[PDB]
């Protein structure tokens, strides 16, 4: 078992996909979502380790006979957790979601295919569906327990790297698998980038197809383009954003308090005074938790006005009056 | 409850007046929609989540809520758009000797995310000592068993709780209400209604080029300007009929 070392490459302008299924024409829409950062460092592989999934992954592969036939997603890729297997064979895109004890070396043989040794087990299935020259790009993300898969196929004549061009990525699939996916791996008989929560200024042409986009967080010129809602910026000085130094750390300072508030004497007391003679106790110079009280459900009613119990633990007061 | 059953529903007509009319439901609370308008509406999918909890825990089932069940068993998103129904199950899910079939998770490393289901039975480690699959001090079983006896009070009587979550994405509608589809009329000021998206306009045949996955053509003002007729996949514009000043 041997694996090729990984290289690095420039992402260029790839990673532009319709964030929604709504038709728009000749309008410079602005969106905020998990996009592939422009000019990002995309990992490069040659024909396969277990790549972390993080928060959405952009996959790309240059193929001419469908050498890469599918993908696998999952947290541990064992029977302990669920997993997802996608295989695009011939004209069928078989997608399944079960608990698989994946084989260490998944293999698919061929031209007629007759060898399929990917997983050793398959239990508790939950979903199933059936549907160089060509560059195939896909975008996989998991948001709110929904797995979204966008795709785009282009005709290219190059093997050096990602072509320096612009294109859209139409959606293909959206499923409610609801799987905490943190790892994935392709299937052999490519390039990988990681999405980030960016803001884009997509340009819809006449026929509702994206032609150009501007990564607002890339560089000052792109940010000015986004602020002006335009691609052409005339000579001048434009105010784009605000700059604020973020806090370096956190400082918490409380006095030389040493004791614990005697709240037992007003809660666990054997007897309580009459309501017309409501007993009052002043509490000062002490430290008292408050999540402890609210964690115990023995209280029939617990209503706070002007303060919330969760925010009560981290707070200081001069004196606390307990009336029983 | 920790293993709340989930059902996906699409491609079928569903009424919603039948459930509302019946009074057998102790709790019938809708968020993001009202039952009266629910009949004349469409959705991309419906997810029904069914489970059992005691009455006191019913308050835990609602958007932006906290609690043992809420934090470790079944969490609802803040943007939940659906109806929570609940009725008493003491008549069936109560045993004189204690109904122990239903279990609820009591410990988890973090609060459960919305629509996230776990059935892990690994012994929870409450201390620094690694609980190597052995129950003991600070090594607590993740689940706990409800008593659920008829003799118990109402606050502990079992209840069957269903959560219907309607998801309306930008995809063709597949769950619609018990409303018949009228005949389409074009080039005339009409009060259209597409998949529950009401409005008034002059539906006209359009030359727009919709993509196969697209359903609504929005406008600069977020007004649905082009629509896809579900029965016949053609794109129709929506122009306001006519308006203007009346000078005298």
């Amino acid at each position, epitope marked *: 078992r041997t694996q090729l070392p990984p290289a690095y490459t420039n992402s260029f302008t790839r990673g532009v996909y319709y964030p929604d299924k709504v038709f728009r024409s000749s309008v410079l829409h602005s969106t905020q979502d998990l996009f592939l950062p422009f000019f990002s460092n995309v990992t490069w592989f040659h024909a396969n380790p277990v790549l972390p999934f993080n928060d959405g992954v952009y996959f790309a592969s240059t193929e001419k006979s469908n050498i890469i036939r599918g993908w696998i997603f999952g947290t541990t890729l064992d029977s302990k957790t669920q997993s997802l297997l996608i295989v695009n064979n011939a004209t069928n895109v078989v997608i399944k979601v079960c608990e698989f004890q994946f084989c260490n070396d998944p293999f698919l043989g061929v031209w007629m295919e007759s060898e399929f040794r990917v997983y050793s087990s398959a239990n508790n299935c939950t979903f199933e569906y059936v549907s160089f020259k060509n560059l195939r790009e896909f975008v996989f993300k998991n948001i709110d327990g929904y797995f979204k898969i966008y795709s785009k196929h282009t005709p290219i004549n190059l093997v050096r790297g990602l072509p320096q061009g612009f294109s859209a990525l139409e959606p293909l699939v959206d499923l409610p698998i609801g799987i905490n996916i943190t790892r994935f791996q392709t299937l052999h008989i490519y390039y990988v980038g990681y999405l980030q929560p960016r803001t884009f200024l997509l340009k819809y042409n006449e026929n509702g197809t994206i032609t150009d986009a501007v990564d607002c967080a890339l560089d000052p010129l792109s940010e000015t383009k986004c602020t002006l809602k335009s691609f052409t910026v005339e000579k001048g000085i434009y105010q784009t954003s605000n700059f604020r130094v973020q806090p370096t750390e956190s400082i918490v300072r409380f006095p030389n308090i*040493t*004791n*614990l*508030c*005697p*709240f*037992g*004497e007003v*809660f*666990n*007391a*054997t*007897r309580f005074a009459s309501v017309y003679a409501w007993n009052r106790k002043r509490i000062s110079n*002490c*430290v*008292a*938790d408050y999540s*402890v*009280l609210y964690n115990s459900a023995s209280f029939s009613t617990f209503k706070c006005y002007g303060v919330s119990p969760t925010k009560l633990n981290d707070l200081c007061f001069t004196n606390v009056y307990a009336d029983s | 409850v920790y293993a709340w059953n989930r059902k996906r529903i699409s491609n079928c007509v569903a009424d919603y007046s039948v459930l509302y009319n019946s009074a057998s439901f102790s709790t019938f609370k809708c968020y993001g929609v009202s039952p009266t308008k629910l009949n004349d509406l469409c959705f991309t999918n419906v997810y029904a989540d069914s489970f059992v909890i005691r009455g006191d825990e019913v308050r835990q089932i609602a958007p932006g809520q906290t609690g043992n069940i809420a934090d470790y068993n079944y969490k609802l998103p803040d943007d939940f758009t659906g109806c929570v129904i609940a009725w008493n199950s003491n008549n069936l899910d109560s045993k004189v000797g204690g109904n122990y079939n239903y279990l609820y998770r009591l410990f988890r490393k973090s609060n459960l995310k919305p629509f996230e289901r776990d059935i892990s039975t690994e012994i929870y480690q*409450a*201390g*620094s*000592t690694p609980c190597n699959g052995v129950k003991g*001090f*600070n090594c607590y079983f993740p689940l706990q068993s409800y008593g659920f006896q008829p003799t118990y009070g109402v606050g502990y009587q079992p209840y069957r709780v269903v959560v219907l979550s309607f998801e309306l994405l930008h995809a063709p509608a597949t769950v619609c209400g018990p409303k018949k589809s009228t005949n389409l009329v074009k080039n005339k000021c009409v009060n259209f209604n597409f998949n529950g998206l009401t409005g008034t306009g002059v539906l006209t045949e359009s030359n727009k080029k919709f993509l196969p996955f697209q359903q609504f053509g929005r406008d600069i003002a977020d007004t649905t300007d082009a629509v896809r007729d579900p029965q016949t996949l053609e794109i129709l514009d929506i122009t306001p009929c006519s308006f203007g000043g009346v000078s005298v």
Partner: antibody
Amino acid sequence: QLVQSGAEVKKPGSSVKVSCKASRGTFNTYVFTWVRQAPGQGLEWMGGIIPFFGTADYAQKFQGRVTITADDSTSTAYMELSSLRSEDTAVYYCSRLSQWDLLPMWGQGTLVTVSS
Amino acid sequence: DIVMTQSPGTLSLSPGERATLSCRASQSFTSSYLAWYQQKPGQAPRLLIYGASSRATGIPDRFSGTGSGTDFTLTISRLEPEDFAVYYCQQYGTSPRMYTFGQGTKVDIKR
């Protein structure tokens, strides 16, 4: 409901460290106290600590030889007694007092023996 | 400090009678509390009265406790064969330094 270390047998002049493990994050906010009792003798308080503050108070008799510490990561209060003698052979207990109840719990007890 | 004295040193009363024990403190409990515990030979101490006036869980109702200031009283309405053991009064509070015990009192069948 506290869990202490098991019964110990030590040579004279040695040291013994008795633990007292606390469940969940109910460690800092409470007050732990170590109390020993020799066989056929009365109850003899030894010391007390508050993990949230970390300062430990000791009985005048036991000053020096004994030391009480507390670790939050393991939620365990430890009491280590040095220069053990036959007089130290006794049953030890850790009692935890809460902020909101006057109901001091007790451990199951731990027998410490110092002899041949 | 605070000194706890228990009286009598050993109480000899027959079963079915009323038992009384007195615990006197060298100083009043300004911010502390008192508890009564029962221990039998070869057995761990058992807490009977917590807060000096509240019976612990499972304690028979015959046991009760009152008092204030520097003096407190533990009372048993009816004496039982299982009730003959050693009794202690312990002063305790939030502050760890408020942890001291009484010398102890023994209850035995009068003969």
